């Protein structure tokens, strides 16, 4: 069937893994389990098309950038994740977007900006900021809670449709 290689990138601890588990295994981790590189493959139906998501859950460890490039070079679509309560992770979003474009040799590669943890109250990144940033990239912005599963399906599915339209 159709295969979509989706890549989840972001700063350490933003919720990359929790978002992916919530999509696939319908539960919230709530647990310290730092990724190195994990892969998930799952047959879905999106808008009536049977497809397979091959999802690569990367790490935010700085020590691991080359491995990230190698796996990132495969991606069709990318979720660039920060946490709405961690300004640094929002700041690091620019470095991920650029590493992605060098590694993909493209400026318009499919991509969603994801503001995770919108269940939290200690918001330090206002939504208007990320909207502007996602506007300047010509990519969508979607807020997620991996805890409450809100926006999770939205964000992946929107990437899938970004990819089909490319
Ligand atoms: N409140 C809340 N906490 C979340 C959410 N998503 C993840 N967390 C919490 O934040 C921590 C990090 O989650 P994790 O998925 O491991 O992040 P990561 O980006 O994959 N980490 P790494 O880069 O090291 O692999 C965990 O304690 C997790 O439960 C969310 O949507 N809401
Ligand atoms: Mg992880």
Curated annotation (Swiss-Prot):
Cited Gene3D superfamilies: P-loop containing nucleotide triphosphate hydrolases
Documented effect of changing residue 34 to G: No effect on interaction with PLCE1
Keyword Metal-binding: no
Outcome recorded upon mutating residue 119 to N: Loss of GTP-binding activity
Reactions performed catalytically: GTP + H2O = GDP + phosphate + H(+)
Effect ascribed to mutating residue 61 to V: Strongly increased transformation of cultured cell lines
Effect recorded for residue 83 to T: GTP-binding activity reduced by factor of 30
Uppermost EC category: hydrolase
Outcome (variant: residue 118 to S): Abolishes S-nitrosylation. No stimulation of guanine nucleotide exchange
Sorted UniProt keywords: Acetylation, Cell membrane, Cytoplasm, Disease variant, Glycoprotein, Golgi apparatus, GTP-binding, Hydrolase, Isopeptide bond, Lipoprotein, Membrane, Methylation, Nucleotide-binding, Nucleus, Palmitate, Prenylation, Proto-oncogene, S-nitrosylation, Ubl conjugation
Annotated control of activity: Alternates between an inactive form bound to GDP and an active form bound to GTP. Activated by a guanine nucleotide-exchange factor (GEF) and inactivated by a GTPase-activating protein (GAP).
Family per record: Belongs to the small GTPase superfamily. Ras family.
Name listed for the protein in its UniProt record: GTPase HRas
Organism annotation: Homo sapiens
Gene field: HRAS
């Amino acid at each position: 069937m159709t295969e979509y290689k989706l890549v989840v990138v972001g700063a350490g601890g933003v919720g990359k893994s929790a978002l992916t588990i919530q999509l696939i295994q319908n539960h919230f981790v709530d647990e310290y389990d730092p990724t190195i590189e994990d892969s998930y493959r799952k047959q879905v139906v999106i808008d009536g098309e049977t497809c397979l998501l091959d999802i690569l859950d990367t790490t935010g460890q700085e020590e691991y950038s080359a491995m990230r490039d190698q796996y990132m070079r495969t991606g069709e679509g990318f979720l660039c994740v920060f946490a709405i309560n961690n300004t640094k992770s929002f700041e690091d979003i620019h470095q991920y977007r650029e590493q992605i474009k060098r590694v993909k040799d493209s400026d318009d590669v499919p991509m969603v900006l994801v503001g995770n943890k919108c269940d939290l109250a200690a918001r330090t990144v206002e939504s208007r900021q990320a909207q502007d940033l996602a506007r300047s990239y010509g990519i969508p912005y979607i807020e997620t809670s991996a805890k409450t599963r809100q926006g999770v399906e939205d964000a992946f599915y929107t990437l899938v449709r970004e990819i089909r339209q490319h």
